[PDB]
Design a protein around this nucleic acid. Sequence first.
DNA 1: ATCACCCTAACCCTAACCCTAACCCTAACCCTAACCCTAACCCTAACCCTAACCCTAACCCTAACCCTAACCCTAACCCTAACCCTAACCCTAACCCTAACCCTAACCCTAACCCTAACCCTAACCCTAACCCTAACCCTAAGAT
DNA 2: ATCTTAGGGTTAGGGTTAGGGTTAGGGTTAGGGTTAGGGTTAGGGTTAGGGTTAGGGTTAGGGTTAGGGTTAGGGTTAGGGTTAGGGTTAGGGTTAGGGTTAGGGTTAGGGTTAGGGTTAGGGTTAGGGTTAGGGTTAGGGTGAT
Lengths: 98, 98, 65, 59, 85, 83, 98, 99, 110, 110
Amino acid sequence: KPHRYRPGTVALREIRRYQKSTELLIRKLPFQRLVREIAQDFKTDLRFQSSAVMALQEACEAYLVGLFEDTNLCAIHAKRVTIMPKDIQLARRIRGER
Amino acid sequence: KPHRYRPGTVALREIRRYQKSTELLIRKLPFQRLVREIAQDFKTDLRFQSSAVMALQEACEAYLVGLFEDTNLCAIHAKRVTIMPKDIQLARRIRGER
Amino acid sequence: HRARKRQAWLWEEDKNLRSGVRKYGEGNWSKILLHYKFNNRTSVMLKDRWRTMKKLKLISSDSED
Amino acid sequence: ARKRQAWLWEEDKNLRSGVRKYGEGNWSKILLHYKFNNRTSVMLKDRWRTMKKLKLISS
Amino acid sequence: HRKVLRDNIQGITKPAIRRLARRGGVKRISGLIYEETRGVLKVFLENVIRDAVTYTEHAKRKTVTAMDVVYALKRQGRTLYGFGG
Amino acid sequence: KVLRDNIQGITKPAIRRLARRGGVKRISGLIYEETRGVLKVFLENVIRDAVTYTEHAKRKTVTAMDVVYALKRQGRTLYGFGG
Amino acid sequence: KRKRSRKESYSVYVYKVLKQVHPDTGISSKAMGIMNSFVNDIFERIAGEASRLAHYNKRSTITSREIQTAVRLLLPGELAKHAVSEGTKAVTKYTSSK
Amino acid sequence: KKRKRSRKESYSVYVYKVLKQVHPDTGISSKAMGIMNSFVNDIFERIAGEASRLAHYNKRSTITSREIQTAVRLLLPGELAKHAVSEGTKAVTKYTSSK
Amino acid sequence: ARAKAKSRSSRAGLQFPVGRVHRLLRKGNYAERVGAGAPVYLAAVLEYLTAEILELAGNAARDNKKTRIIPRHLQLAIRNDEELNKLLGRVTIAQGGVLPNIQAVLLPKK
Amino acid sequence: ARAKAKSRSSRAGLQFPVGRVHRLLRKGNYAERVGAGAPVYLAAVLEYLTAEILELAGNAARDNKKTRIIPRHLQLAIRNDEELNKLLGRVTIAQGGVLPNIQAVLLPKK
DNA sequence: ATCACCCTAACCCTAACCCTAACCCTAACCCTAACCCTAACCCTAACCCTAACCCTAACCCTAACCCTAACCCTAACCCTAACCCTAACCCTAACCCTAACCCTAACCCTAACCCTAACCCTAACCCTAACCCTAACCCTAAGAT
DNA sequence: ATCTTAGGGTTAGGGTTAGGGTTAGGGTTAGGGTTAGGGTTAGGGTTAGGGTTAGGGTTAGGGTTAGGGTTAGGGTTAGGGTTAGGGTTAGGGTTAGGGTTAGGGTTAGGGTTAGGGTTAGGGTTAGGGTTAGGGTTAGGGTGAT
C-alpha cells in the first residue's frame, strides 16, 4: 500500500492551482469547432477572426467560473460539499437566466 | 370544542388571498414617514409629490415580493418550509446585490 | 555548453523525477537517474530541475506537520 | 535602468578578439579579460548575436 | 416647523412583512426575518432616494417628483410603468 | 461539410478545471452534461447577436468587436479585445 | 393669461388599436398610463440600438435597416419575426403610395 | 501614391504618462494597456450617456460641467465620486483662471 | 395649388403616428440624419407590439368577467406569455400584482 | 502674429487629452452643443480613475515582485477595492483570473 | 384508509349607488407639401491582408480502469419556535382648511457656442539595435562511505 | 579519497522596449455670427402642517404541535493512482476570398414657410364597477368505523 493522498487534499491543491493561474482551461481546437458548428445554424460560410474566437472563449470561461461560484454557494447552503445539477438550476433560476 | 385550523391552512389561504389582489400591503402613512426620514439625510427642507411616494412604495413592494420568491426557493432547496435570514442572504448574494 | 543542446523537460521526465524522488527519496539523484528514463540527463540536471519545480510549485506541497 | 548605450569599433574588435581568445559562450571571463566599459555578460551575448544577424563576423 | 423624524423603520410592522411574504408564496416565516427585511428595505430605499434627490437637485428644484423616482429606478435596472415613464 | 457532436469536445477534465477555479471541492457526475447544455445556450445567444452585427455590416467575417458588442448588450462587458 | 404647456401622449393611438383588436373592450386610465410607458420604453430601446449600430458602422443616418437590426437584436424570436414582417409591410406600402 | 493606412486612436500615451506619475519605475504590458483603453472608453460612454440623458430631461441643449458633475455623482460610488468631483472642479477652475 | 395632405400613417396603413415618431427620432440625438423609412418601420413595430399586448390583455379581462382592461390584466397578459415576459423581465407594472403560484412542496400532504 | 499654442490639457493641469475628449463629445451625438468646461471635467475624472487603478495595480505587481503590470494585477486591484469592484462589477478582464477564495466549510477540519 | 357530519370561508347573486370612462367641441400647434441645395452614400475597381487549408511530428492530456473511503441520504427522536385565535387598544385613513413656498411662463439681453480658415504639433505607425527574464546548465566546495 | 550533492553563478533564447524617422490628422487661434440660457418678476398651483373621528389593523399573550436540528448507519458514488495512445499543439508554407481604400456621381435628407389637419384640454353624462346584504357550495377537521 504506497503513499495515497486522502480525497479532498488533492482537490484543495487544484483549487489553489487554478485560482492562481490565468490561462484558459478549455482546449482551443474543440472550442473553435463548437463555435463554428453553433454559428452554422445562424448563417452559412461564415469566417471568424482569430481574436473573435479568443474573445468568445474568454467570455465562456468567465461565465462558467461565475456560475460554479454561485453553484458552490447553493450546495453549501444545503449542507453538502458536492455540487449537483439542481444547484446549477437554482443559481440560474435566481440570477434570472432560469 | 371551538374550531381551530391546523398550522399551515390559514397560511395557504393568505397566500391565495394576497396573490389574487393588487393593493399595497404596507400602510401608506408609515412608509411616507420612512421616505421623508431617509431623504432628510441627503437634503433638508425637501418636498415630495404624492405620486413620488407612491412610486417609491410600488418599487419597494415589488422588490420585496420578488426577494421573497427567491428566498422561498432557497429554503426549499435546503429541504425546509420556513424561510430564514440565511436564505435572504443567499438570494441577495446570488442576485449580485452584495 | 555549445556542444550539448539546451532542451526542455518533458511531462514524461517530470513524472519520472517526481516518482523517484518519492520512492528512492529526495537527494538520491544518482539512483533515480538509474532506474527511470530521462533524455540524456545527468545527476545534477535532475537536481537543477527539482530546484526549479520547487520554485514554480510543481512539487506536491510539504505535508502539514 | 541606465540609458541606451551603443557599440563602437573598440568594444567590437575586443569582443571579436575575445571570442577568438576565450572562445564563444565564455562571455563572463572575456568581460574580465578585456575592457568593455559598462558591458554586462548578457550585453556581450546580445552584441555577438547582433554580430551574427548583421554578418559583421567572419573568421 | 419642519421637525425631525426618528425610528420610522419600525412602522414597517411584522404583519406587513408577512403579507409581502405571502404574496411571494411563503408558508412559514422565521422570527429573525422581520429585522432582516427591515434592513434590506432600508438599503433599497436609500439607494433609490439618493439618486432621485440627485436628479431633483440637478433641476434646481426642492420637490421630488414621480419622474425623478422613475429615472432613479430606471438607472438601477428596475424600470417602473405607470407614473409617467 | 457540417460539424457534429463538438460539444463533447468540452471534456470532463476541462469542466473540472473550470469548477476548481470556481472553488468547488467535489463534483457530481451528472454536472458534466448539465454544464454542456448551459454553455451551449450561452454561446448560441452570444453568437446569434454577433452574427446579427456582422450581417448588418455587410461583412462575411465575424470580428472580435462584433463579439464585444454582443456581450455588452447582454450585460457582460469584456475588456482586452478592443472597444 | 399664461399658457400651460401641452403634454403629448400615445393614448389616442392605443385606443384605435384596442378597438381594432377588441371592438367592445375598454381601458382604464391607469392601464393607459402603463401602455404609454411601454411604448416610450420600446421606442427608446430600439432608437438607442439603432443609434449605436450607425455609430459602429461609421454611418451618419438611421435607416430602416438599422431599425430592422435593432428589432432583431432586442425582440425575442417570434416577436422579432412578426415585427420585422410588419415593418417591411408598412415600408413597402409607404413606398408604393409615394 | 500607395494606399494610405487608416490610423486607430487610443489612450496609451496618456495612460503611460499617468503611470509614470504614480509609479515611476513600474512598466505596463500591451494586454494591460488594452484593458486600460477599454476601461477609459467604457467610463467615457457611461458618463457621457448619463450627461446626455440629464440634459434631455431638463430640456437643455448643452452638456456643461454641471451635467458631467451630476453624472459622476450618479455613477461613481461613494468616495470615488467625492474625489472625482474635487478633481473635476479643480481642473475647471485652473482652466478658467488661465483663459 | 397645394394638394390635399395625406398623413404618412395613412400611406403606410398604420394607426401610430409616423410624423411624430419622425420628430422624436430627429430631436432625440440618435443620429445626424434620419431616413424616410425609419419612422414608418418603427411606428409599425410599436403598433404591432401594442396590438399583441392589448389582445392578450383583453382576453385576460374577459376571463375575469370585466369589460375594461386594468393593470392586473396587463400583468397577467405579460407574465403568462413567454416572449413578452422575456421582453419585459426587468419591468414592474404598478398595481399589477403577481401570477398565482404556490410551490408543490408547500401544499397539504393529501 | 498668432500667440504660441498652449494645449487645453496644459491649461487645466491634466495629462489626459481635453481636445480629443471635446471632439468625442461633439461626435458622439450626446447633445446639440458641448460646453467648454465639460471636456475638462470629464478628462479630469477619467485621469483620476486611471490613476487610482494604476496605483493599486502597481502595488499588486510589487506584491508579486514583478516590475511590469499585467492583466492579473489589474484584476487583483479592482476586485480587492470595494468601490472599484462596485464600479466594475459586470466587467470581465481578459487573462485576469479570479481572486483566490476558498470557502471555510471546504477547508480541512483539524 | 373511509365516510359522516359540523362548521367556516370563499363564492355567487341583487340591489343600489357613482364616478370614471367615453364622447363632443374648439383652438392652438405641429405635420405636410413644395421648392432649393449639398454631401452621405452608392458603385466600381484595384490592392493587399489574413483566414482557411494542408502537411509533418511529437507531446502530454484524456480516457479507461480498479479500489476505497468519504459522502450523501434517510429514519428516528426531541424540543422549541412559529401558527392560530382572542381581546384590548391605538393609530391609520379620510376629510377639511389654510398658509407659506415653489414652478414656471414671459420678457430681455449677453456671453457662450458654432463655424470656417491657416498653421503648426503631436500621436500613430514602422523597424532595428539594445536590454530583460527566467529556466537550463555549470563550477567548485564540502562530504558519506 | 573520490564520485556525489548543495548552492551560488553563468548562459540560451525568446520577448520587450527606446529611439529615430515620416507624416496623416487633428488641435489651437483668430475673427464673424447667432441663440440658448441666465436673470428678474408675477401669479397661480402645490404641498406641508393643523385638526377630528371611528373603525379596522396591530399587539400581547396562551395553547399546541409541526418542523428544524441532531445523530446513527448503510449504500452509493467520486476521486486517486496507473497506463496507453490519440487528439490537440506547434511549426511551416500557399492562396484566394474578402476587407479596405480611392475616385466619381447623384439622389436622399436637411432647411424654410404657409396653411390646414390633428390632437390635447375642457365639459358632460351614463354605465361598468363597487359595496352592502343574503344565501350556497367547496373544502378543512375531528371522531367514529
